[PDB]
Amino acid sequence: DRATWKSNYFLKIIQLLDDYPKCFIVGADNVGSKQMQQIRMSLRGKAVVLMGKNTMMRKAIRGHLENNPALEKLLPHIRGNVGFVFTKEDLTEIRDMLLANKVPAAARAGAIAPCEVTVPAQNTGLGPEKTSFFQALGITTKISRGTIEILSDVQLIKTGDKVGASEATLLNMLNISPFSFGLIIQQVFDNGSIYNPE
Amino acid sequence: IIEPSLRQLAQKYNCDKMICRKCYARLHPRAVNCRKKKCGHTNNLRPKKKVK
Amino acid sequence: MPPKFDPNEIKVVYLRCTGGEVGATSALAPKIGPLGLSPKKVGDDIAKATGDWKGLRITVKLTIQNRQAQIEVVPSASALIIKALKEPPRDRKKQKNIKHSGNITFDEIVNIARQMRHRSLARELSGTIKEILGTAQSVGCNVDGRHPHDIIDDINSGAVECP
Amino acid sequence: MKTILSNQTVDIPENVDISLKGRTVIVKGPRGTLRRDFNHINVELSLLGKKKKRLRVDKWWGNRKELATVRTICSHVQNMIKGVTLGFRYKMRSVYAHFPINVVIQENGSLVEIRNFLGEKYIRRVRMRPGVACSVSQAQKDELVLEGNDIELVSNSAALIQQATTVKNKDIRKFLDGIYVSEKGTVQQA
RNA sequence: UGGCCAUGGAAGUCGGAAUCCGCUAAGGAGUGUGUAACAACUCACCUGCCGAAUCAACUAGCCCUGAAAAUGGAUGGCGCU
Ligand SMILES: [Mg+2]
Ligand SMILES: [Zn+2]
């Protein structure tokens, strides 16, 4: 194990490179197995998704094989948490399909905020429970007959702001999930030419 | 009653510990061996039992 | 169903499993049953009627409540349908030694099993599904007097017929 | 066995100036001096570089437990440098399920009375190690701030109030009370 | 995939016969926590950072634990690193 498998992994990546002349480098990021399965089910017919390591630092060996240049441009961009998407359809269409899929995934306590997150005026869906968790920071909440109702549309977290722990937990209890993303596109490979999501 | 993050901070100091099976020494939770020369750095350790 | 007692439509589903016969120990209704207008003894009788004459060696019970009328169905599990297609039927009370005979062939019968799978598996068609259901069998032991393991590798059938 | 030589370097920053009378480092900068003696560690505290940029610590013919000191001297000088530049700031939050541990500093930082711990009539007076200065913080309700240059003295003084507030003859898993160190940061970050 | 035996409940988890395939980058028909039972949590394969050795299982030397007695006490004594 892990000598024959390592050789089998080299055979997987080279065959995918030989089959498809176009690859889409996608950042994995905070991602679930459930997400990856959903993406597999959506992109089943056309594309083939892969997730690699520093044996993707091995496109060099494909470029060595009595043929290819152009794969030399792709070596610096295999950094961070990276996985590939091999495919033959198109480039701008596939970019739109990747952007369109995505997933919610609830608040990460500590990380940055991508958009201006809000709390709409609505009931929590509980009995006479702790209103003190909501009112600790600066939110107007009443016990309007049993249910804890928020009485105003207020912005908690703004763009480029750090998400606190107590406010993250309250958003998770409310089922408000603007944070996270799913997966991001950093760079592209299209028959030799490189693009930067443009 | 008591703020949760504040609680877990005081747990860290009181309850997130290893205990020696020979000498009952209270030890840091990463511990593989005991401190105590009295029990010869036993290595028979157990976790401190959590309050239910 | 939220505030007091109201059916706006009620096509409510919940998943019970196991149900060869009535069952003395039951555990069918309560919790989910009575609140929602489905009773207990009548619901058990309806559950017996659907899961009667096959399967009597364990079954699955999705219960779609139409206000007061439950629609029990038998959604297929792989090992259940293998045990249904065994050497039937010595149902209950000897029995006893035990339910693991497991020499009942099924070559082209499992083709129907891979077809009846609710898509699932993230497959590249039956070629891989044949390998899965040929090993799901804890009891059966594959064709005539074969093993499961590595005979699966050399399949020469039903690649294009199962879609 | 006897390792023919070991060493390390401690890159002092251009703000600080360190000086060594033999084996007795004295480190001075923004906040103040911090002397420390190592007569008891047995090493060659060379100091090299124009602009006096790095402190080197050889250790010749060391065995395993003698070579264990090399890094700990190097590290102690690192803290000494940090103390001089940034200065240490230990923060400790009070915790209770009832009796809200009433703290009050006294002379300057020196004294720390710790009243009403667990509903006890005994008022704990806790002095601070010379240099360290306690202060009751704002922007956080039940929380102290110990600041000072010499880390050793700070963390000791933190412990002093941590063990002061201890529970005897009770289930300490149940009774989680006292003033515990929450955070070991600096007076200024840069 | 409420897999099978076990219904008293074990859908990975009081126990035991089993014990493979898919997706696979890859996850045991499951190390535990805990559950009536789940859930929820926790325990490979791979990356990001950092920057050369790292780690396991035995084995035998000194040292230490194991190592409790009654008048005050005996490597002969003083002492000795
Ligand atoms: Mg008591
Ligand atoms: Zn011990």
Side-chain angles (χ1 to χ4, degrees):
Chain A
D1 198 287
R2 208 146 84 264
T4 53
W5 167 55
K6 280 192 172 189
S7 67
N8 195 18
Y9 182 85
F10 277 113
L11 293 167
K12 282 183 186 180
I13 190 61
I14 192 158
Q15 194 200 246
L16 289 160
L17 287 158
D18 291 320
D19 193 5
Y20 298 107
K22 169 160 64 59
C23 183
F24 264 77
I25 302 164
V26 296
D29 305 19
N30 185 31
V31 67
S33 53
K34 188 68 260 186
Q35 275 208 60
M36 293 303 304
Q37 290 162 30
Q38 283 182 339
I39 295 156
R40 247 63 159 246
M41 291 302 302
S42 64
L43 299 167
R44 175 140 285 284
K46 179 57 63 263
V48 182
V49 186
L50 191 61
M51 260 283 291
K53 39 164 285 158
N54 298 333
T55 51
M56 299 286 213
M57 293 291 295
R58 206 241 64 187
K59 281 177 172 170
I61 283 69
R62 175 61 173 80
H64 284 32
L65 189 80
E66 310 87 41
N67 192 23
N68 257 350
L71 300 178
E72 293 169 41
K73 229 293 185 68
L74 307 161
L75 297 166
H77 286 66
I78 307 162
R79 291 297 180 196
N81 193 11
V82 179
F84 295 157
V85 180
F86 293 105
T87 169
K88 214 183 285 186
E89 176 187 319
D90 223 60
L91 58 100
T92 192
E93 293 161 32
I94 295 187
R95 186 192 164 285
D96 284 307
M97 302 315 283
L98 290 165
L99 192 71
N101 192 284
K102 73 168 69 178
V103 127
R108 181 95 288 182
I112 61 162
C115 298
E116 298 190 326
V117 176
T118 63
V119 177
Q122 202 74 98
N123 63 75
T124 52
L126 290 169
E129 254 63 52
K130 271 69 176 181
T131 54
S132 59
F133 292 127
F134 305 121
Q135 300 189 37
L137 293 310
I139 309 171
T140 53
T141 64
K142 258 107 293 192
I143 307 168
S144 297
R145 274 258 60 183
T147 55
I148 300 159
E149 295 195 332
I150 299 94
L151 263 288
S152 54
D153 296 24
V154 184
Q155 305 187 322
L156 298 179
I157 306 156
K158 285 82 173 181
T159 52
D161 190 52
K162 305 294 182 172
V163 183
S166 54
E167 69 181 359
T169 52
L170 99 79
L171 292 164
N172 283 34
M173 292 301 300
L174 290 172
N175 305 296
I176 298 161
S177 179
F179 299 111
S180 201
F181 225 53
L183 45 76
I184 293 169
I185 176 174
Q186 294 94 314
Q187 221 216 231
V188 197
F189 176 72
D190 304 313
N191 300 256
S193 59
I194 283 71
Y195 290 87
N196 186 55
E198 280 179 325
Chain B
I1 180 65
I2 190 159
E3 192 262 40
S5 79
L6 247 208
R7 187 184 221 273
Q8 96 83 21
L9 161 275
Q11 291 266 340
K12 183 255 287 218
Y13 284 116
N14 302 349
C15 297
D16 303 354
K17 299 289 198 161
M18 281 313 274
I19 307 291
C20 173
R21 214 72 147 289
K22 219 100 125 174
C23 74
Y24 308 98
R26 188 192 293 179
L27 306 173
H28 72 300
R30 186 82 114 269
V32 300
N33 275 42
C34 185
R35 216 92 61 133
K36 302 303 183 188
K37 186 156 193 172
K38 78 212 290 184
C39 66
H41 325 291
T42 323
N43 98 233
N44 279 111
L45 311 173
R46 99 218 201 284
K48 178 152 220 196
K49 294 262 173 64
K50 309 306 290 195
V51 70
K52 286 284 191 290
Chain C
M1 58 290 183
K4 54 200 180 182
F5 177 68
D6 282 84
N8 198 51
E9 52 189 49
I10 315 306
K11 298 187 178 182
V12 180
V13 194
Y14 101 79
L15 183 61
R16 154 135 281 210
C17 201
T18 77
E21 285 289 304
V22 278
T25 193
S26 289
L28 180 275
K31 291 197 176 192
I32 305 158
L35 200 73
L37 292 156
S38 53
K40 3 73 188 297
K41 198 264 175 64
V42 174
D44 186 35
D45 292 6
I46 297 154
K48 194 229 282 179
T50 53
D52 213 319
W53 38 81
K54 282 73 170 183
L56 299 173
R57 289 157 158 173
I58 309 164
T59 55
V60 194
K61 281 277 165 289
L62 71 92
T63 55
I64 301 157
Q65 292 96 43
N66 278 235
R67 302 190 193 183
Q68 301 106 46
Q70 304 101 69
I71 301 161
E72 283 88 315
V73 193
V74 183
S76 60
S78 55
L80 292 179
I81 63 169
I82 292 158
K83 292 157 86 290
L85 303 158
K86 210 195 292 186
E87 294 177 41
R90 47 178 71 189
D91 295 322
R92 189 162 285 182
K93 297 149 186 170
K94 302 185 180 181
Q95 226 197 44
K96 170 273 223 167
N97 200 355
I98 300 175
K99 303 171 180 171
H100 56 57
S101 56
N103 291 298
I104 330 91
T105 71
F106 25 71
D107 313 353
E108 305 102 323
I109 307 168
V110 193
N111 277 38
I112 299 156
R114 34 249 176 185
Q115 280 175 319
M116 80 172 70
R117 292 301 92 176
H118 50 72
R119 310 294 128 161
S120 69
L121 310 147
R123 74 249 188 143
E124 287 106 68
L125 276 169
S126 53
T128 60
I129 313 172
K130 287 193 157 60
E131 313 210 322
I132 295 163
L133 298 178
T135 62
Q137 44 155 295
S138 303
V139 184
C141 301
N142 208 358
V143 186
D144 296 308
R146 286 192 189 173
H147 313 263
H149 296 313
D150 293 16
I151 298 153
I152 285 154
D153 289 28
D154 300 320
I155 284 157
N156 303 309
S157 55
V160 194
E161 299 189 325
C162 299
Chain D
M1 78 308 182
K2 305 293 175 171
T3 300
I4 194 152
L5 168 64
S6 74
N7 65 25
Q8 228 169 22
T9 47
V10 175
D11 294 301
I12 77 95
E14 296 294 312
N15 193 3
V16 175
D17 174 40
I18 85 166
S19 62
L20 23 73
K21 174 49 180 165
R23 183 150 31 111
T24 308
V25 298
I26 129 78
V27 180
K28 81 225 79 179
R31 299 165 59 78
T33 59
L34 283 177
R35 303 178 85 267
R36 212 211 212 258
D37 192 82
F38 293 118
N39 295 71
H40 82 106
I41 233 85
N42 196 321
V43 297
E44 201 211 47
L45 294 184
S46 302
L47 188 59
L48 66 101
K50 194 152 282 191
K51 313 153 184 173
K52 222 71 66 256
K53 296 218 300 164
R54 57 252 299 285
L55 166 82
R56 209 255 295 284
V57 39
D58 291 337
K59 201 283 110 71
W60 300 92
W61 294 116
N63 50 277
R64 197 145 167 284
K65 270 162 58 262
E66 269 71 313
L67 301 157
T69 56
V70 174
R71 179 158 145 70
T72 206
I73 302 140
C74 146
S75 305
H76 286 137
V77 178
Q78 255 111 226
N79 274 331
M80 213 175 313
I81 284 154
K82 176 178 272 68
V84 158
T85 55
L86 311 192
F88 290 77
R89 185 200 296 265
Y90 278 65
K91 284 180 197 179
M92 50 212 310
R93 302 213 81 243
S94 167
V95 190
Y96 56 96
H98 223 310
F99 305 98
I101 296 159
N102 198 297
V103 181
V104 46
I105 48 63
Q106 222 74 78
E107 284 94 76
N108 268 335
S110 281
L111 225 301
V112 184
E113 304 296 340
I114 309 181
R115 310 204 217 285
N116 212 341
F117 171 92
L118 277 282
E120 289 179 2
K121 263 55 175 158
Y122 176 35
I123 72 203
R124 266 146 282 255
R125 44 267 332 292
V126 189
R127 290 275 294 182
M128 261 46 204
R129 302 321 236 75
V132 187
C134 183
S135 56
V136 179
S137 86
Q138 310 94 316
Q140 258 283 42
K141 203 174 91 288
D142 295 308
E143 143 74 357
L144 273 68
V145 174
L146 311 186
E147 285 176 45
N149 307 38
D150 200 331
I151 179 180
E152 288 262 17
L153 302 196
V154 169
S155 44
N156 196 70
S157 79
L160 267 174
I161 86 174
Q162 225 210 274
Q163 275 170 337
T165 57
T166 41
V167 192
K168 331 298 280 179
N169 307 310
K170 296 289 194 62
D171 182 347
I172 58 138
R173 298 113 95 264
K174 191 89 182 180
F175 295 75
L176 299 154
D177 334 69
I179 306 169
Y180 313 90
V181 170
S182 63
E183 192 241 284
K184 320 183 174 185
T186 60
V187 176
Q188 40 163 241
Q189 291 79 351

